[model samples]
Target: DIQMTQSPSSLSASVGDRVTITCQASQDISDYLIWYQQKLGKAPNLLIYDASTLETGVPSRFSGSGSGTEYTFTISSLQPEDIATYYCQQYDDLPYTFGQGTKVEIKR
Candidate 1:
């Protein structure tokens, strides 16, 4: 399994702001990256898969990009309901690996 290093462990941003999160893999994994959004007391939901493909019913504001060793997740406009922890996972190998995660907060 490859190692994943995520940045900005936590952040606070105002509603409607554009938010970005990044994940870097120790080795090339093509577009096998996946992004998940976990809300409080709820299961992690799939936001993006195959690096840049959004899952069915997912909001357009949420998107993913990049390839090989680096990938990025973006929220075009943050919403109140969008507050959650985001994680990136790679399924290129037998043993999957996940990023540390990024917690999103709404600024007062």
Candidate 2:
């Protein structure tokens, strides 16, 4: 199983600020990385797939890039609606794993 881990479990950002989360794989999973965003009481929504490709319906401000065992998901010009938990997943094998998550919060 590939384990995924994220940094800075939480982040503070204002509207229009760019936020980034790093995901590291326990082992190399090539480009099978996927990024998701979850809002309170809602299922996670796919943002990026296969590393850099944005999933359909995702905002253009959301982008991803990386390879091998490391990857990053970035939200450019984050909106109020973008405040949520971001996670990374590895689907290269069974028993897919996800990062703890990085919650984007509003900065005072």
Candidate 3:
């Protein structure tokens, strides 16, 4: 098991703009990185897996990447409905670990 951390725990951004949050793993775990977005009162949906692959149904504008110890998630162009908290998890190991969620507030 490894620890994960996210930066700028919270952020506010406007629509049609790009924004990103950083995530880091305690150490290399063989490309086990994954990104998930969760909204209030809803379950988190996978956005990226194995570091950079987009999951089915995720918006094209949402992207992610990683290299062992670090990773990031970028929203190419935000939307009002994109307001949610983002998390990173290492899927290559047991006792799954997650980063402290990054909250994003979308502007109308």
Candidate 4:
């Protein structure tokens, strides 16, 4: 079983701003990484997989990159509808783990 930890539990962004979140793995899991975004009261939707493959239907502004024990998920341009909690998951093994999450908020 691998553990995942995320930095900066929350983030604030304005429309069209870029935001990034980092995820670290307890052990190397090759390139089996996936990112998801969850909006308030909604289920998380897959964004990136296999380290950098963008999932279909995900907006072009959402991208991921990383390898081995380090991974990153980034939103090229934040949108009002993009406000949500983002998380990373590793499917390389059982007892799969997820990052704590980075909650995106709109700046006043």
Candidate 5:
């Protein structure tokens, strides 16, 4: 089993700024990482999977990169509607584990 470590924990940025969040696994997990976004009171929506593949319907601004034990989730241009909590998960082994959530908020 592997553990996921996320960085920054939370952040506040203005619209149009680039947002980057990192997720590092305790061990190499290939490209099995997945990224998700959840707004208040709503179910999580898939953003990226297989490390860098964006899910259908996800905007191009929401992208991912990296491989193996280190993965990155990036928002090319933060939008006002992008305020939410983002999470990373790895299913490379039994008992999938997730990184600590990172809350993204709009900086007023």
Candidate 6:
């Protein structure tokens, strides 16, 4: 079983600034990585897959890249409505694991 962890755990950013977060899988998982966004009280929404493919309806400013045990989720520019917690999940195999999460907040 692979363990997942995200760096910084939390961040504060202002609108218009790019936001970058990192998620690392305990071991390489090829390109079977995923990123998701979750609002304070809402369910998580798929953001990316295979490391860089964005799901339908996601903002184009969002991007993902990386492979194996290291991966990253980047928001080209932050938006007020984008403030939320993010998660990284692995699908290289069953019994998949996920990073604790990354919380992003408006700098205000």
lDDT of 6: 0.90
> Model 4 — TM-score against the truth?
0.95
> What are the TM-scores, per candidate, against the unseen true structure?
0.97, 0.95, 0.94, 0.95, 0.97, 0.95
Q: What overall lDDT goes with each candidate model?
A: 0.95, 0.89, 0.88, 0.90, 0.92, 0.90
Instruction: Summarize candidate 5's per-residue lDDT along 1-108 as a digit string, tens digits.
Output: 799999879999999999999999999998999999999999888898899998889999998999888888889899999999999999889899989999999898
Q: Over 4 Å off in model 3, which ranges? A: none
lDDT by residue (tens digit), candidate 4, 1-108: 799999879989888888989999999989998998899999998888898998778889988888899998888898888988999999999988998999999897
In candidate 1, which residue pairs get closer than 3 Å at backbone N, Cα or C atoms, i.e. clash? none
Global Cα RMSD, each model: 0.7, 0.9, 1.1, 0.9, 0.7, 0.9
Clashing pairs in 6: none
Task: Name the candidate that leads on lDDT.
Answer: 1
On a 0 to 100 scale, what is the lDDT of residue 61 in model 6?
95
lDDT of 2 by residue, 18-75 (tens): 8888999999998998999999999999888998999778889999988999899888
Question: Which tens-of-lDDT digit does each residue in 1-108 have in candidate 6?
Answer: 988888779999889999989988888899999999999889998989898999999899999999878898898899999999999999998898889899999897
Clashes of each: 0, 0, 0, 0, 0, 0
**What TM-score should be assigned to candidate 2?**
0.95
The digit string of per-residue lDDT tens for model 1 on 29-62 reads 9899999999989988999999999989999999
- lDDT (10s digit) by residue, model 3, range 1-108: 688888979998889889889888888868888888899989998888888999888889998877878898899999988999999899777878999999999765
Worst 10 residues of 2 by lDDT: 1-10
- Clashing pairs for predicted structure model 3, backbone only: none
